Amino acid sequence: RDKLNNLVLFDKATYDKLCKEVPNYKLITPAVVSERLKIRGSLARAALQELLSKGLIKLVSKHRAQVIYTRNTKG
Amino acid sequence: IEPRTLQYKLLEPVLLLGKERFAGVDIRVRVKGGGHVAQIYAIRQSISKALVAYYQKYVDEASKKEIKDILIQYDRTLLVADPRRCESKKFGGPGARARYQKSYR
Amino acid sequence: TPDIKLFGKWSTDDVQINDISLQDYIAVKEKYAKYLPHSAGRYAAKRFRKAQCPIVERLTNSMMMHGRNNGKKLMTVRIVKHAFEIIHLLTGENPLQVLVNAIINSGPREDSTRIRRQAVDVSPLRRVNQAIWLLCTGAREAAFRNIKTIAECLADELINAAKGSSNSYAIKKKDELERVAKSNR
Amino acid sequence: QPIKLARVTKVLGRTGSQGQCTQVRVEFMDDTSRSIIRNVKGPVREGDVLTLLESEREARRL
Amino acid sequence: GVTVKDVNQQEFVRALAAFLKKSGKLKVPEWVDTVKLAKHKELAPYDENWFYTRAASTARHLYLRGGAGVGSMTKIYGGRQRNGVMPSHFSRGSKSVARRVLQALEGLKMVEKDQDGGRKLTPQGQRDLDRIAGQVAAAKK
Amino acid sequence: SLVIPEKFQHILRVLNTNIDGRRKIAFAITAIKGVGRRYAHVVLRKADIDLTKRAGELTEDEVERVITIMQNPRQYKIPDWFLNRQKDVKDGKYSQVLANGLDNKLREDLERLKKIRAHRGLRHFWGLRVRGQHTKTTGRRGRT
RNA sequence: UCAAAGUUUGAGCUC
RNA sequence: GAGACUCUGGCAUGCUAACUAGUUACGCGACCCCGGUCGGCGUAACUUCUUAGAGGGACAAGUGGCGUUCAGCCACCCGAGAUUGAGCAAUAACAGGUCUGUGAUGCCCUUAGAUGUCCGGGGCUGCACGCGCGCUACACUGACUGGCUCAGCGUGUGCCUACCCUACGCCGGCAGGCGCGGGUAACCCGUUGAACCCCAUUCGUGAUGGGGAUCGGGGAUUGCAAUUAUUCCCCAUGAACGAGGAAUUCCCAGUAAGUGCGGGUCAUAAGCUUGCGUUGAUUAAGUCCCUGCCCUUUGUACACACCGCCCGUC
Ligand SMILES: [Mg+2]
Ligand SMILES: [Mg+2]
Ligand SMILES: [Mg+2]
Ligand SMILES: [Mg+2]
Ligand SMILES: [Mg+2]
Ligand SMILES: [Mg+2]
Ligand SMILES: [Mg+2]
Ligand SMILES: [Mg+2]
Ligand SMILES: [Mg+2]
Ligand SMILES: [Mg+2]
Asked: Which GO terms describe its biological process (chain C)?
């Protein structure tokens, strides 16, 4: 009945949209970004691992089944 | 300390009594029988017993009562034993309690 | 943290139970809290041993369903652990206050029975048990076949339940039962 | 029609298919004076609190 | 200082694979590319230099308990042959890959055939265990 | 990687066979006829590939490299026991047999069994359970 | 303070 | 009959005791920063641990109401135990089943121009169709890929009887191939080298790596012989199934449910069947509404008993 047709790669404009907005969510999971922007959870994990590489997000708990990252502590 | 998912279960009594009682000791715990969680919930109770036995045995008993009472006032499972053990499957059925499946039709 | 406790990063005092109705019988305070829901067990042995069971454990108890997850308490505990942290993160309230709002709204104050059935307001053990089971079935249904994790969906579910949005299956059951009861009570 | 809390003072009796619904006398903790009867489904004990959206209804005892 | 029990094992295998590559004197088999980790396994190991990862694990089991032959390492290293529709059973590892991991570590002086049989960990092996233990300990510290 | 690659192929072609970009490279290449998940995986071990990449990332030249190794496995160093044509019918030279080669080899399996008039050829035509099943109890969607 | 609830091989029961 | 009994669990640092069990006192050795580690070595007694014989051990022992202040209940306290758990299991059925275990077997029939018997082969697996016991699912609380970790059931070379457990070094993905050993077994298998658990990746909500039915071609082994695939192995096609409608199986405590591990049989070795561990809830302390059950009363024209008897037209 319902299906998820998610995009494999970000466009450049979407890259600007990520650089702007994604660090503003308090929950940053690859699944969170996947549901909002209709993108795959695995590349989502790689994207959040990328905000880690560029140095944009702090990890709360990553684990083989389920990972969780966030924008670093707000205060 | 693997499993690391069951560590706070291990510190609950340690947090309950505090570091001052356990500070004088260093304790290795040998474990056997049961399974991994059963053994974990075992060594939980074990070291708390060994320390109560340490103050009750080699020094004055007021330390044993104060430790033991703080334990009683927090939680009774620490003293009342879990007698619970895994029940065996029985012949006459596909599962544990069922006796064989009566099958109409 | 042996002498004075900061439970991880949580205050003992200053957590107000808002609803006067369930205040004694939600025996949730100063002692019943523990570091995990998970505990040796024996909590369903005697009648009120269930009562003395911690309410976080009762959330764990309800969460594990649909076969493959029966008797995987640490995993469904970890679910409750990361979801509660998340509830605290997103709404900004003490997770048990949001949850008490869940107990308050989702607990059905009455039910119907054969005395043609008539409605009667229920006892606290079943009424809390019922609230926990209901919002668990809601979180599962919402999170099933979605990338979003069960624990994060479970945090979102306790938030929307305390809010009372009428989007929870638990509220759908409550509203159906109440209005049918008014027609035939 | 406000909300009313009531304490179970006395289990009267169980009605119901299973003798499952206690008709119970309750004391209101707001107005210590008032008291009412009504049956209840689910596990009941002498002394426990209901949040009745109405105190006026009453179950037929058998 | 530190030991395998002191270490978190996941980053242990990654540090040791790098450590054994740095040594670059295991004599890795020719078929490491072709082989699959068990007839009951579906894909090849996730680590690209996986033969090094199991050389680590097998050696470290011989530390944990010496005298661990091939069949011994496969029993400890056994598991669910998830049979789908049929019921599950215990399944040994693959011989060729296990026997060659043990023969690889016998080659480069990590493991040693003790008198009266079985392997004991050699002076070089216990050295390498506590050095990489200190390295990984420094990483987690 | 995150920017969209150049010449992104929503479908690749191989052996007149279409390949899905959504699947991960090892399992996506298996879309090709005459190569499966492990055999494809073997060609990928023989090749220089970081298999954590996705199948939309890799180029048409990579699928052609995997394919030439697959077609001439003897020429590109694939084992005899790994092949999906063990002991080939026409010449008995190890090379890989493909989709159209596969359908023709199919015609040949039918030609062999029917001409000799073997029972198992008869079992292909009749459509019965060879594996020790009761046909008393199976094959309903087809048989009405 | 009462809407309803039908049948059962011919192929062998028994001091 | 229940109970009782027999066995098991548990209290016995007490009796009797052990190089096929270990023990506590030390020291050495390599290294790490004196010591720590080691199934590397040495110093004796003893039985705390271990093994198992004899004995011994907890009983409503304490209290409240209630009760002839009786039996005792309920609740609470008191405690390592205030039901450990089985085996056996009353009278009487069903005209459900067993001549398909046997020279178990009654009666009737048969036996050389045989309805016997022997040799080989077959059906039981024969398939448009249907059901019951079962197996697998619909995924991310999860799967894919590595690493890590405590067990309990177990066995082992046989009268005839072809196959033992297996340590130690080499060969194939797998079936399986070459050196010496221990063990007929607390000595060798064997520290019973289980999974789960625990960590990082990878997957990404997809009829998906979910699901693995069906089968082409080929390689092995099990067997005198498998076409109704012997089994195992190698590569591939890949049905429905997106969490269960009226229905119905299963459950109150370590239970229900997840998850593997072993045995009988046993050539391949658990698809039968029967166990073994491992993780671990909800709910009720209530009632007999449903479903059954048990007693009392009651009516009955049934008594091969409501699956009953029994009435009229045609
Ligand atoms: Mg293992
Ligand atoms: Mg009528
Ligand atoms: Mg008839
Ligand atoms: Mg008895
Ligand atoms: Mg006979
Ligand atoms: Mg013959
Ligand atoms: Mg999910
Ligand atoms: Mg599949
Ligand atoms: Mg396939
Ligand atoms: Mg009369």
From this structure: translation
Judge if the beta carbon of E113 is closer than 7 A to nucleic acid strand H.
Answer: yes
Which 20-79 positions of B have CB less than 7 A from strand H? 31-41
Q: Phi and psi of C145, rounded to 5°?
A: 50, 65
- The phi and psi torsions of E30 (rounded to 5 degrees) equal -70, -35
Chain F residues lying within 8 Å of E34, measured CB to CB: 42, 45-46, 79, 82
Q: Are residues F72 and F115 in the same domain?
A: no
Both F69 and F7 in one domain: the answer is yes
A:F CB pairs within 8 Å? 21
Q: Which of F40, F61, F79 is the last residue before a domain boundary? A: F79
Tell me which residue has tokens 């050696």.
E59
| Nearest ligand to the C-alpha atom of residue F39 | 9
| Residues of chain D contacting residue C122, judged by C-beta atoms under 8 Å apart | 40-42, 50
Residues F49 and F65 in one domain: yes
Asked if F118 and F55 sit in the same domain, the reply is no
- F48/F60 same-domain check: yes
Give, for E111, the enclosing helix (H) or strand (E).
Answer: strand E111-113
> Cis bond leading into C95, ω under 30°?
no
Q: Which among A12, A11, A28 is positioned nearest to A62, based on CA atoms?
A: A28
Smallest Cα–Cα separation from A9: which of D35, F8, B35, B95? Answer: F8
Domain membership of residue F60 as a residue range:
2-79
CA of A30 vs chain F CAs: smallest distance (Å): 15
- What is the Cα D29 distance to its own chain's centre? 13
Euclidean distance between CA atoms C72 and C63, whole angstroms = 10
Distance of alpha carbon D38 from its chain centroid, rounded? Answer: 4
Asked if the Cβ–Cβ distance from C38 to B12 is below 8 Å, we say no
Residues C74, B6: C-beta atoms closer than 8 Å: yes
Residues F65 and F107 occupy one common structural domain: no
Q: Are F131 and F137 in contact (CB under 8 A)?
A: no
Q: Please report which ligand is nearest the Cα atom of E77.
A: 1
Question: Among candidates B3, B41, B47, which has minimal Cα distance to B26?
Answer: B47
Please give the tally of structural domains in chain F. 2
Domains of chain C: 6-183 (1.10.455.10)
CATH classification at residue F31: 1.10.8.50
How many Cβ atoms are within 10 Å of C49's Cβ, its own excluded? 11
* C163 close to B (CB below 8 A): no
Q: Select from B82, B17, B83 the least CA-distant residue to B48.
A: B17
**F17 and F74 share one domain:** yes
